[PDB]
Design a protein around this nucleic acid. Structure first.
Ligand SMILES: [K+]
Length: 324
DNA sequence: ATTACCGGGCTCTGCCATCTTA
DNA sequence: TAAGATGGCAGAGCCCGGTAAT
């Protein structure tokens, strides 16, 4: 009865809430008051509170005791209340989609038990919160799958493969095993690719590749291949290029292309580009802004050493001065 | 005094489908 | 027997600078 009124004064988007979790609105008891007070208690602005509820209405079904206990467990990993407010604003669902604090506590035990440091649990919680709402078994699955995948390739102690990858790729424990398998076999196939090459690739520069959704990797590589072929680069060169800079698989196809095109419209050859893959770190805006500045001076770009295009502001700005 | 090499810092939700659970 | 709990999916970059090399 009193439910819609409170939410309305709270700033909530009621129509949106009802669409996401209609069920919640057919309960006779809801604790929307205690939650407001609870988050207010921990420093959340009223606008955040509304935003959290607008996106995860079920949040209002939790009791002060539960909320307080879950919060204190997060504070076993994160150090300030503010850190947690921020995470919840960014992703409500991770905190509120479960109310099994025992399970949560077991995740924390398990993850410690795998040999991860607190800075590593902190990193996980901060950037991949939803890790801690996983079932214990689900986190166990992924960990067992990595160990198995560690030894299924030539790794000396899998225990440490797990730590390296989980540190380099914080988002791995919120991916399905299905998905991460398919991304590994995608790399193994498309490129050489013997166990050791593969292993560094996964731990180092191609670590983010394991998070790509189904076939989005395959599809984004296809585009790379076409667009580079079209410009006169051979498959070898395409492979060499992408392996020396796998980040390029994460770009939206359209971005890659526009990026390639903005560079080349200025008479920078496809050759300069793939022998200096990092120029592609820069957003298109930055590239575009820098291109303007240099051609504005006496630079011809056709023959310049274009590495500066992806230098830091400092080093770039310094060098631009010197050119004029 | 200048650039290359390379790794690190940031960084991941919001939706739907299929169970459990009471 | 309807909600709650849980799993899984699509979508996706940019920047900085230490230190080696010259
Ligand atoms: K109920």
């Amino acid at each position: 009865e009193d439910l819609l009124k409170n939410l309305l004064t709270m700033g909530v988007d009621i129509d949106m809430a009802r669409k996401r979790q209609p069920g919640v609105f057919h309960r006779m008891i809801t604790n929307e008051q205690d939650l407001k007070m609870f988050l207010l208690s921990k420093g959340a602005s009223k606008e955040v509170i509304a935003s959290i509820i607008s996106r995860y209405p079920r949040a209002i079904t939790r009791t002060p005791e539960n909320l307080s206990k879950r919060w204190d467990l997060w504070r076993k990993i994160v150090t300030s209340d503010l850190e947690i407010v921020n995470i919840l604003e960014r992703s409500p669902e991770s905190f509120f989609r479960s109310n099994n604090n025992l399970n949560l506590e077991n995740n924390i035990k398990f993850l410690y038990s795998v040999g991860l440091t607190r800075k590593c649990l902190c990193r996980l919680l901060t950037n991949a919160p939803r890790t801690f709402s996983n079932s214990l078994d689900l986190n166990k699955q992924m960990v067992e799958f990595l160990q198995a995948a560690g030894l299924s390739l030539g790794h000396n102690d899998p225990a440490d493969f797990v730590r390296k990858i989980i540190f380099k790729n914080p988002f791995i424990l919120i991916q399905s095993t299905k998905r991460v398998k398919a991304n590994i076999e995608f790399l193994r196939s498309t490129f050489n690719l013997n166990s050791e090459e593969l292993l560094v690739l996964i731990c180092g520069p191609g670590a983010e590749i394991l998070d790509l959704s189904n076939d989005a990797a395959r599809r984004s590589y296809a585009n790379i291949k076409e667009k580079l072929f079209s410009l006169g680069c051979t498959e070898e060169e395409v492979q060499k290029f992408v392996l020396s800079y796998p980040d390029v698989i994460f770009l939206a196809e359209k971005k890659f292309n526009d990026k390639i095109d903005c560079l080349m419209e200025e008479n920078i050859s496809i050759s300069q580009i793939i022998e200096n893959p990092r120029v592609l770190d820069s957003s298109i805006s930055t590239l575009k802004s820098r291109i303007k500045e240099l051609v504005n001076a006496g630079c011809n770009l056709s023959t310049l050493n274009i590495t500066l295009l992806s230098w830091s502001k400092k080093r770039y700005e310094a060098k631009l001065k010197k050119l004029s």
